[model samples]
Target chain A: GMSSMQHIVELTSDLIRFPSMHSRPEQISRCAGFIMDWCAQNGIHAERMDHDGIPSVMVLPEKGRAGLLLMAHIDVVDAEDDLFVPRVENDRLYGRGANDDKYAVALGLVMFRDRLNALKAAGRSQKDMALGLLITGDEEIGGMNGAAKALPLIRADYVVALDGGNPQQVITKEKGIIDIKLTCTGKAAHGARPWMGVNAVDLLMEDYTRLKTLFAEENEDHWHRTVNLGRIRAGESTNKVPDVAEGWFNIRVTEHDDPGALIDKIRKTVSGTVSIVRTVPVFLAADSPYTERLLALSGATAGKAHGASDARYLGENGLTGVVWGAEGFNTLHSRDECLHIPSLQSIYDPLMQLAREMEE
Target chain B: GMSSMQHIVELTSDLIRFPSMHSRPEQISRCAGFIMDWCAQNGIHAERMDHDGIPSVMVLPEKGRAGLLLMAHIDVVDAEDDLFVPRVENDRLYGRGANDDKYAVALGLVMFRDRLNALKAAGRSQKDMALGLLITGDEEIGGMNGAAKALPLIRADYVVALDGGNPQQVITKEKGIIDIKLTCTGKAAHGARPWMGVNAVDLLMEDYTRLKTLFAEENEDHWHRTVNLGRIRAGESTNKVPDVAEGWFNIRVTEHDDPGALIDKIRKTVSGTVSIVRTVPVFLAADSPYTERLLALSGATAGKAHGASDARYLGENGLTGVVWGAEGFNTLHSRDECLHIPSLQSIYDPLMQLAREMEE
Candidate 1:
């Protein structure tokens, strides 16, 4: 009976009991204590990184270089009422983040502790394949403070974040976002006298129609971009002509397109002015030996993600990581969020084996 | 010496003292007592024709046939605190009703009283040539109760209301009225998602522009007719696609045009719906001996009036009437309204000439 699998499952169950969702930095730190206690029992020391009191911890071997970093976050999106309570039925573990990420943190720590034991047991004490566990307590809101800011203190030759699609699907690139505000101007007059005033609503309708056509996605080939008009508003009184009308829309842009060029084309097409509110660059990971070996070993191919991930920041910070996780059945971030208990337990074997082959 | 010209000026000043503006039928009825008191003092009996308490008075002689009716209203537009105080400056007497029919009422009463004396002096009484003086109290507003309803009480072959144009500008016809409403319907939706909604305001604009062009007079021969765009309204919120828009317009049609045909042409030109809120047919006066004699003697041609008057009702009732006023210079309804004193003094000659010609 291997203690790593037993402990990984139990620790995941215990961590989900925290109700650690949304701005709960203290709960993340409380979750961090579980890792510290386990680390102490295994006679290994680790450092808890602090950035504005958001829970952060990482284990290391020697100075200058760490072989691999198995990263995970314990924070999760909220659940309704008792949905946060960990439950297992039909070999599926259910919790707010049973599938999203809480499962990965438990597995990462157990693997780090177990690998150290196996390496010492086989008398292979070489420092070439030291595996480290880096855990943060924020991700559901955004990974900015948790993952992005902690990269310097938790550096490695490569990173493997267990937050991705199915175990067979490694993510290579993700889409970015852009928010646009549209505005139109007109003259106001008494409702009884239309010729004396310009109906801004009319002008705004024309501009709205023209701008929509410019971004219209025809055919099935529009995985490169999409537009969603979310809000619009105009006149105030029924008896008076409207003088001003404005609205907002959001765009999800694929890897090959540029937001600036899209906005330029929109401005050129519509009479109304278009201004950008926010922009995030598309993330594309580089081809690396680590990913090639992981893909071969895990029998998976890389795919594109329609959304962003913390791995995006890692790639931007001159690091390589396989955005890999347990077999996902579209249950991530859903009301039926769940983890396949067997899939999570099986990953423990490969993580320790991968650590040993690199001299784990 | 009997008071005639001085009496006309002094009575006008006495009547002007009362603020018989609007809805003050009490003030109007109180002023009616003055005319009754004058008739009693001059030893002539007149009927105080009360139609819903809006003063209507008539003085007639025993006759088999009444020849002419001299009709004038005693009511005047409201005045400021001291504007009712009759003051003479230059050759003019100034007050609220110094020109707006008050002078005509005073002259009509003086002529009635003075004519009784002349007829008694000559010892002549005949039914073939008879003149009746009719005074009403509601003309500044519509004459519904005063002139319109009380017309049957005073039996005369024809009517002459001294309330319009100059002595020479005998108003024989007036323009009619039409009020049309235009409506457009569309689909409503969020401004951001404009493609999902049809804009009613846009549809209304198209209808408005098209209707305006269709009604637009191509030549200058439109002097008898004019159009005024009065009120319009559409969507309340700018961020929403308006589902309804409507507007109203007024057309002052002369004796030649048809409002129904005009609205039909507008409907055919535009893609929106058009309906009539109210309509009044054109008025054309009949050529008669009474108006002919007045036109010949006054050296004034019978012409069309741009706006409606109480005289228009006379033409509708099969009675020929000329709306002739003392010489006016656009000061009738103004705060500084005043009458040329010589105009009042000179009108006495016509009263005697007309009275002698139509003797009682």
Candidate 2:
């Protein structure tokens, strides 16, 4: 016999134990199994779909279509060993996925179970409701195998991706991502006679400096495009001039920007070679009846997110959605990542009201 | 029954058989053993000195002092496996240490053997000659354990280090070396919101640019100081801003520049942490009567070298020396490294004349 708050925390703590990261594929699958087992224990029929080793659990009404679907991912980014051993401190749950999506998964599970229990007390069946839950396991790694493939199969009018945005804000838009790798080549020679050879690191740095000029615009909202010089590597020995150097840049482009044109500009600006590593489409949600009702019911401000998430796949799947989650204080993907327990409690009633008010 | 030129090639080919590099230390000792056994077979008295496992073979007159000493190293830089297997093409020998120093070792050994035979034929002994030979096993790795520890034990008025410079140029000066490692620290955050965190690579590149401006003086002879950006490493994940970055610089300074002042200027100009990795003093030979006589006899013009060698230790040991070698076509430390056959023959008579004319 568990209280509502206790059950939510217990479920989140249990989910955090899996350490569902890409490096440990077995743990991701095992975490999916735990979700399936949890649904079975709660007397709910759940279907597990896997694409390219990425697992997704779907729990829907008998009609297989829902007015509202709560989406949350079980996977979390890699973290220190002790972060997987979850702990609660000062009414907050501390773990690798506490603030990311695990708390949302547990919150969704409990919200669905309580709704079914309320219907059972009224002697009604699931056919009378139009609610569903979709648990995915690859959001941190682009969701290519999980949300990208499984989202197309889901028939939902609206999806609330509980992956980003705080309890006070509902993210209706997210910027796109583009990763670029730059390579510069030069001649190698003895370090003492540097005139006899070229230093590739110098060429790379010069190219990087020229490339940074493209992203020099300043603004209050920072809604414009941005680039981060993430990683760079060059040379093997200290006494020899390096023959080659490589750099990786992580760029977040706005909906107003054209990625292809940006890449062309980068190629024209830098002397070194440029190659695109990855590109994620921007998420721009179309307002729907369900989305309007949820926003009105939740009393949260609509906003845009700088970070991209699995919600990016929802619009392409013909589902209007918002990236909403419990309060995280911008600690996602960090050692201090944690969820505010009171914030989870505050969102529970608003989400239930939206599901109950939706039509079949 | 080998001719003099053929004997030099044979001994050089035999020495090249052992890939005596720092990575394979056993090969260095094995090469040393081969040299010792060759000396014993030739009926010559040679003493082996080991300091920190670095071996140096000294063969001097019975009085333990000589007017002239021929110096060369058996150890060469790491190269391809096939390069260690010596081969001769057209009149030149191709191998790892062909033109660097091994040819000089073989040439010195043969010259010492022939002089011994001549003395014996005239009813004399090694005590009657004023000549010596020193073969070291560590030169490419700074010569600390080889020449630094061994040079003080030998008594020679003048030395000829056969390591660099062509047959037409005798080296009298060499630049000094300084290796610096720069580390920059910054805050870490998600790449999408780079404004929330600082990129260490950006700071590193900025600091490097500021550091390069200190060495912009140009000269035709390239006698001015120079700096090479050798290596740089930063960041791990593409989606996260790096908190720290590191870069290594290889700087060569002239005899006129104060290294301490240069380092202080770098520290004042850059906003990162700086640490010195290594420093080797300049090799400025103070000319002796023997050096002048050898230059006149060999008909080679005195010049300065941009590269450093073990000869840097000679001036500090109260000994004057010249860095002379067979024509290498600037192929040392490269895959195309080779020794010109006739150049070795051309310098032999002049070296013999210098030793023969020196006094006890």
Candidate 3:
């Protein structure tokens, strides 16, 4: 058991040192290469799926089917150079991707390897165990090239996305993402005669205030729709009144609302022109039988995720799954990001039991 | 008179070739050097005063005193490369500095030279004349080095700043400038939960609306104080609510209000912190006896200028002056900027009469 935990820690530390982020494409490929090499050394059949320079390493028991699929990613959000240097202290692993992802990749790899060896000891072959592991490299920047492209080629009965949430709470639902760009126009004139010309920034802010009235409902847990004015650019010089202003808003929509109707309502309410830049569908898998079994077996409560993940693509590709991980302490993308080692170790036995059911 | 007009046109055209803007310090010096050379050819003595890399050519009868001093700047606002090439069409000269100031410089230089030659013809010497000319290089960007620094060194009973206002009107009052920097603070959180954090941009806009109430008075001529939100900078990413926002405002204050009291009221009325970045006093010289004489001789009306000029520095230096120039068609800083040929010729005789009265 000590050697098993040590293997997971060493693998996670090695993966964290590569700084595999979407911002660094070469590192993404390098980390994917390392995963394939580790699989070859352990005599596990693994294949690299390259889509638009983003790589995803998939380990399946058969050519196109896996009873239990475990999904994880090696890529991470942008972070400082020092964050890539993995450190362990007080039974916790500290790194950029340690809490967000790389640790899950290591956990999945070690679990697949030890289970395969145990099945061999029972005179079982690789084809007999219907277990799979999917390690991606573009989950941090929308899994369009990783899970979206690779998951379609493999048919999995159920997927366990080891990306977010704690061991005591399983996330079965997530809010959708909608990014809007607002543009306002006005007449330009010298700053000395402001009344002679309209300032577009003023119009933009006025419409922004009016737009706030549309989403005024909020609860204690915040299951309602929310909007954030994330970026703005206006005025060229301090001596001239600006004619054009632009603002970018990130709005999270709940499953009960229609994004199309909401966008139409926004267009009718604001004086400025509103355009949807991006739209991501909400992930709804609370009724999945796999989630019920997961919550019952691990003694975890069912919960919802505020942020999005690659689990959304699993439903898009006709597969059902839930996002589940270890205790992260809400420091995934921050400077002090760390993973609880004991919580990670506690989930190992339960995941192996679920994998053994696939063999039966 | 025809030959005198021809010389003024040639000199103004020559000066327009140099793009003498504050952004290009070499051109400012080069244009000043050209003025000194032009003076030497005409046997009129001129000296260059260098202050903080800005140049000003002074042509004085004595060491410091001039009965009537003519002020004109050679530097122009930035424009296209093609605008630097002086073009003549329909008896009008078109160029970046044609209407703004280079034409006035030529007119003043020629007036000084012809007046000196006339005095010589009447058996009078340079010492006997009581007129002077000041050609400065920094006026478009506040005139801190050109007028603010040099005006104190030279003493004159009255000055005619040949920079702005049409031939039909003589500007005796100009609005003062007050640039304010507003800063707002808020709490930052993920864009998904904007309710959990305060957006500084929202606070800034709310304060901006409240600040607008202070500058509500307006009339047909726009003589009241005016505020313009010239520039704003806020937000770094599209997924996080911004914690801080900043705005730069350009406010024009009339002589009726004190800028200090207005700024203190602004601080008390707004939630954001307000700080004065720059302050320029209003230019006032309507009561000057020289202004009365020039208006009587030239048949021009006394008017108030909405924009500021280097004339503000004349008041700061204990010298009385009014900004008077030829017809610019409200295109001084534009691409098609040109001086009306007839208006330039019309002011010539009236200015000469005012200079002659100084000798009497």
**DockQ values, each candidate:** 0.03, 0.69, 0.62
Taken in order, the candidates have interface RMSDs of 8.2, 1.0, 1.1
Give one digit per residue, the lDDT tens place, for model 1 in A1-360: 344465767888888887777667677777788778878888667777667767777776654346778888888766786767888888788877787788888888777766777667877542544687778877654576777777766567677777876667877777776777778778765432345567666676678667667666644534657555554556544434567777566566777678788878888988877878766667677888877877777777888766556776776677877677886575665578888877875566655666666652
Compute the lDDT of residue A30 as modeled in candidate 3: 95
Point out where model 3 deviates above 4 Å.
A1-3, A17-53, A62-66, A80-92, A120-129, A217-221, A286-288, B1-68, B74-98, B116-138, B145-157, B285-293, B299-302, B315-319, B329-340, B357-360
Q: How many Å off is the CA of A181 in candidate 1? A: 3.9
Question: lDDT tens string, model 1, B180-289?
Answer: 77788888664433455676756765776676675565444344455544445665433345677676655677666777777677779878787887765555666777
Error of 1 at B285 (Å): 33
Residue A173 displacement (Å), model 1: 2.1
Off by over 4 Å in 1: A1-6, A23-44, A62-65, A119-129, A137-142, A183-208, A216-222, A230-248, A270-273, B1-360
Best by TM-score: 2
Q: List, residue by residue over A7-38, the lDDT tens digit for candidate 2.
A: 89889999999989988889999999999998
What is the RMSD, in Å, between candidate 3 and the native fold over all Cα? 4.0
Chain B TM-scores, listed for every candidate in order, come to: 0.81, 0.95, 0.95
TM-score for all models, in order of appearance: 0.48, 0.89, 0.86
TM-score, cand. 1: 0.48
